[PDB]
Design a protein around this nucleic acid. Structure first.
Length: 195
DNA sequence: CAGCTCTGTACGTGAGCGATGGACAGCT
DNA sequence: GCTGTCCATCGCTCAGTACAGAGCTG
């Protein structure tokens, strides 16, 4: 079956997804790594199998239904940027090693200390579990979604964790089951501008 | 024993690819 | 009536998390 218009999966696995980063951003969405479609398109969260653009609209973070082609307009119009913990493309997170994640978390903390957005948004618990242990030296055991009790070191950057936008996750089967975190993220951002 | 990590595993939903079937229209 | 296409429809694949209940170490 052909899902990538004649492009082999082995070619996509060698491709990367660029960062959409700048200064004065309210939010930076940090993914785990690119999926095969993101590597294919060269844009963040294209469908099918991803809830991100649906949740972004349902929560009120965007005024209309946006898509992956709109990712570069997000810093200027919305104050939202994009990065990932791991550079390498795989079909799923389970194809990544501990070594890649730990190297990723180090480069991620450097990137965050340069751009210093108001909120570092972890789109996936697994990446915050690895990051928090490596950076803050905390226990992974009772880790929760939402606002974290630690800031990115040397910055005023907050850490906010969300269930991955991937539709592989059966615990939050629909975009509607994830929207709560997007709404609480919209509220946290609104509170920062208010205060 | 007490807190921790580690690892195999099952799980709902909705989009899209390739195949299928009923409707439909051409054919002095 | 026979032919071949259209286009909705269908059936299969595909796009992390929490849990059980150890093991590990003070």
């Amino acid at each position: 079956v052909d899902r990538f218009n004649g492009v082999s999966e082995a070619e996509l696995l060698t491709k990367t997804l660029p960062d959409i980063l700048t200064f004065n951003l309210d939010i930076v969405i940090i993914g785990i790594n690119p999926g095969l479609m993101a590597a294919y398109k060269g844009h963040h969260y294209p469908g099918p199998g991803n809830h991100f653009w649906k949740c972004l609209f349902m929560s009120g973070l965007s005024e209309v239904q946006l898509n992956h082609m709109d990712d570069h307009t997000l810093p200027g119009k919305y104050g939202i940027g994009f990065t990932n913990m791991v550079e390498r493309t795989t079909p799923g997170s389970k194809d990544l090693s501990s070594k890649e994640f730990r190297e990723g978390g180090r480069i991620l903390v450097q990137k965050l200390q340069k751009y210093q957005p108001r909120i570092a948004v972890f789109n996936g618990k697994c990446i915050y579990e690895i990051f928090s242990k490596e950076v803050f030296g905390v226990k992974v055991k009772n880790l929760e979604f939402g606002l974290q009790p630690h800031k990115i070191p040397d910055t005023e950057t907050l850490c906010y964790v969300m269930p991955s936008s991937s539709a592989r996750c059966a615990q939050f089967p629909r975009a509607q089951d994830k929207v709560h975190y997007y709404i609480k993220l919209k509220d946290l951002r609104d509170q920062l501008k208010g205060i």
